[PDB]
């Protein structure tokens, strides 16, 4: 019943969206991958957001936009519930595209997360506050990560 | 049951920043607790504190506040079950480069980074709003109000 | 006759906008001053742009938004003709807000100019390609600037 | 009947120049591609600028120079009408060459644009304020970009 | 009987760890290599430190963590003796991960050294104030390095 | 019996030096405060280092130089034992003077610590491996700091 | 016999120029202070340079321009002998105007020096290769500096 | 007769050093290439400088050191006449090693030039103030660079 809308500005971002989606599927969380440009197809984005917003189910938007990221703040100020910004990595201007996701006005509150798997995890943990099944899944995932590190210590320690 | 936000800062010096976050949560009617604890200097105290909060049978978020190199947000985040939000205090040092210590988490550590204290409070409300209608109404009023003032600034001095 | 629409993201940008407006007036160019947020008042901004775009006259938009500038690319993607981005100055993250004005997607082409007086000049010089009166005022303005520097040197 | 003069500081810039040229051709806008150095061949540049400035037709200059960009300001202070700065991409010093294009004195007003297709698009949109054939070409272009995005979404 | 505990946050840091390990061995210094994350395995790390802190021998901790380095400060605040931070290299964000190792609070004092062999050299030179054999080993090492540069100049 | 030589490149660094000295006093550690430029008075520095190096007591050098720090590496390459770099703070070029302290060649291994009180603490903690009086002093210090934080929490 | 021409792009840099002049006066070196813009009064700059270039005496030019520095490259491309860029200090964009002075094309070789006093000193030291009176003056100046440091250490 | 002493902190710098040399050879200016570390071999660098400082000919030093450049200011604070700092390129920390060459104390005044061919050209142009042959060579050189550019346009 939770839904995560993965909304990217360009078809060029699809590979970054697919990393987020794969990880969401591991948590058993439903997702939808969509494309719209805040700069070029603003009204198409508004229409889309209106469609998803009308759904009576707990939702999150994870917004993906390279270069100067207008999409994440655009979606965040339109929709009611929480959103997550997860821009694709860039080395242009030594990663300075990140400030465009960071520097929001008062009243715009997307959660910024750099890594696609971590964006999925944050989504899961947001639902987990009220969804016991998803909390069980997160618990398993993080315990597994921790056990692997301890197992690496046991195996490789000298 | 009633949402709780634990606002956990690494130093009593962070109180100003924490109080900004707390005051904003109050306007959403969301209960908070403000606490102090250092990931560097008082690790076992933080762990003990977090076990106490985690045993509470209500939906919760942690907002974690640490200046300089932020070890606290990732530390809290890796220990607790639910989501957390990092909202570091502002700093000019090294043209603001302390932000990277909040951004650059390992795989499997997923705190939500938000810069402004009022926006950290906003995000916390919006997370709960997915399930809490009272908070969703409060959020809608707040956001719509923000929008109205801008439209009103335009009408009042557009020329 | 030309119109420059000066659209800013917040009322706090007013002093920056008036520096631009001030200078447009000296070029004999009509301007309008408006406020609208690309993040918080999207439909309102889309609704204002449609009104201006229906006007049968040569028009430019100058867009002013602090912090992460979404406004410039949002407006520029919506309107037909040219636009100019002129963000207010900031020292946040050693001026790193500038990259949000610089890094546009292919197909979004605002002209970035830093100084308010230079945004106005650029707007004047765009009209000047087709407006002889605006061309004369610009020739006058630019020669004055040059003559002052030469005079300054003359005292030395 | 507009003309865009693409002027680059080095023949090494030619790849970048041609990208701008190729795009202008799609808008049906005539262009010239020239080479000349603001630091090493100043009189060759000025002589060129004089010949272009004497043409009675609307014109823009797109100025391309790597490293510390003096060329865009040189051109812009010489010619009457608008100019556009479009420096080639560089990763030297985390891309800090961009600041030499940004940081103009008062009275020097080139339009900074990063992407060569957006420099072409901006020039088209500047002429579009008065050239209807061009306005039409821009509209078809921008609408095609928008429709492609919406098509990409449809597949999903 | 010095001991250097080489503690890294992930097995993906092992190649960097083995560089410090190798160099320490050249100085005759016993090491232990361990894995533990301050973010993900805080209580495991604590347990591990308490064990080493109970040893009555002179000890250093060299702490390795990529991205945002919480491990070095975490360890340093827990243990009584000196520690050394030696993060694995990175060009992400122009190397900005370094600040997470530099910016400690007052009362947290790990020694930051970039290069793994210099982290080993620092460790040695630390023990050398009281340990004559290590002091002789460091002497030989540093004098050789100097003699080689003088030798390179002599071939030229 | 431990000694710390605090060597600064200029009398204008004395404030920073004095912060380190005052803190060393609180750990019961003898210091010398000295002035010598690597760039301007290189032979004076060398002769001074020889005088201290001739002492058979365990010792550290804490080296202070603003701007491009050549002093830390110069001293570190000359002396046998460990040294600590503690540059004075600067916001010049957003703090980029720090790179001159970070970027040592292979075989130069000064401990970089930003804050003067943390430089003193590192020093104490280095001696604490073998000097139980100093370790007692460091235990008091760190435990007091931790207890104060926990006390601050208890008020909440 | 030598002459240093101090050429600034704007009268707003006068204070910076005077610091350079004051220091050159202590070396006994004649200077001229002038103003001319690379972007706005190129002909005027060329005319001035032609006048100084005719003088049969050893000369340097020290070129001062804030923001994006085109001036130093412009002068250096024009004049036969060496030049020194000494831009005014800015903290805008973390000091990134400095890259506009660094990033010269092949064939354009101004010597960059940050500090006004050090620009004066470099100038003196260039003429000193052939001028023994200026060499004697530099020797005294730099020996005064060293002795000041050595003297500061002897008290403190 | 001018002499340029090209002094590098390490043999790994030789590539950069040889680029400067090759250009100086085009001007007819004699060079020496030498190695010494300001960190590790300070008393050797100091003894080397004393040898060059004793030659009665106009001289410049071009100093080359990667990473945190202590060498340029070290040599500049010892020798009498002008020096030129020309560090090798590096992408580390977005090029931030450059600040170690820029940020000299008052009384230390090496000329910073980035490109090896430009360090050579600056060296030539310093000598050119008093050396007519070298002045001639520089006019030929700079006119040739401008001619090639104008030629590029003509094709």
From Swiss-Prot, chain A:
SUPFAM superfamilies: N5-CAIR mutase (phosphoribosylaminoimidazole carboxylase, PurE). The keyword Transmembrane helix does not apply. It catalyses: 5-amino-1-(5-phospho-D-ribosyl)imidazole-4-carboxylate + H(+) = 5-amino-1-(5-phospho-beta-D-ribosyl)imidazole + CO2. GO terms for biological process: 'de novo' IMP biosynthetic process. It is an enzyme of class 4 (lyase). InterPro entries: PurE_classII, PurE_dom, PurE_prokaryotes. Substrate binds at residues 10, 13, 37, 40, 66, 68. It holds the Pfam family AIRC. Keywords: Lyase, Purine biosynthesis. Gene3D superfamilies: 3.40.50.1970. Transmembrane segments: none annotated. The keyword Lyase applies. Pathway: Purine metabolism; IMP biosynthesis via de novo pathway; 5-amino-1-(5-phospho-D-ribosyl)imidazole-4-carboxylate from 5-amino-1-(5-phospho-D-ribosyl)imidazole (carboxylase route): step 1/1. Changing residue 39 to N: Lack of activity. GO terms for molecular function: phosphoribosylaminoimidazole carboxylase activity. Its EC number is 4.1.1.21. Belongs to the AIR carboxylase family. Class II subfamily. HAMAP family: PurE_classII (MF_02045). Catalyzes the reversible conversion of 5-aminoimidazole ribonucleotide (AIR) and CO(2) to 4-carboxy-5-aminoimidazole ribonucleotide (CAIR). Does not accept N5-carboxyaminoimidazole ribonucleotide (N5-CAIR) as a substrate. This is Phosphoribosylaminoimidazole carboxylase. The gene is purE.
From Swiss-Prot, chains C, D, E, F, G:
Keywords: Lyase, Purine biosynthesis. SUPFAM superfamilies: N5-CAIR mutase (phosphoribosylaminoimidazole carboxylase, PurE). Its EC number is 4.1.1.21. GO terms for molecular function: phosphoribosylaminoimidazole carboxylase activity. Substrate binds at residues 10, 13, 37, 40, 66, 68. Catalyzes the reversible conversion of 5-aminoimidazole ribonucleotide (AIR) and CO(2) to 4-carboxy-5-aminoimidazole ribonucleotide (CAIR). Does not accept N5-carboxyaminoimidazole ribonucleotide (N5-CAIR) as a substrate. Gene3D superfamilies: 3.40.50.1970. It catalyses: 5-amino-1-(5-phospho-D-ribosyl)imidazole-4-carboxylate + H(+) = 5-amino-1-(5-phospho-beta-D-ribosyl)imidazole + CO2. GO terms for biological process: 'de novo' IMP biosynthetic process. HAMAP family: PurE_classII. Pathway: Purine metabolism; IMP biosynthesis via de novo pathway; 5-amino-1-(5-phospho-D-ribosyl)imidazole-4-carboxylate from 5-amino-1-(5-phospho-D-ribosyl)imidazole (carboxylase route): step 1/1. This is Phosphoribosylaminoimidazole carboxylase. Belongs to the AIR carboxylase family. Class II subfamily. The keyword Disulfide bond does not apply. The keyword ATP-binding does not apply.
């Amino acid at each position: 019943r939770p839904l995560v809308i993965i909304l990217m500005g360009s078809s060029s971002d699809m590979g970054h969206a697919e990393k987020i989606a794969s990880e969401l599927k591991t948590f058993g969380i439903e997702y939808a991958i969509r494309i719209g440009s805040a700069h070029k197809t603003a009204e198409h984005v508004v229409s889309m957001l209106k469609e998803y917003e009308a759904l009576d189910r707990p939702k999150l938007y994870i917004t993906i936009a390279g270069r100067s990221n207008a999409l994440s703040g655009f979606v965040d100020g339109f929709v009611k519930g929480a959103t997550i910004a997860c821009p694709p990595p860039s080395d242009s201007f030594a990663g300075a595209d990140i400030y465009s996701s960071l520097r929001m006005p008062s009243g715009i509150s997307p959660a910024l997360v750099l890594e696609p798997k971590n964006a999925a995890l944050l989504a899961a943990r947001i639902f987990s506050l009220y969804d016991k099944e998803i909390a069980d899944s997160v618990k398993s995932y993080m315990e597994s990560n921790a056990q692997k590190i301890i197992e690496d210590d046991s195996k490789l320690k000298r």
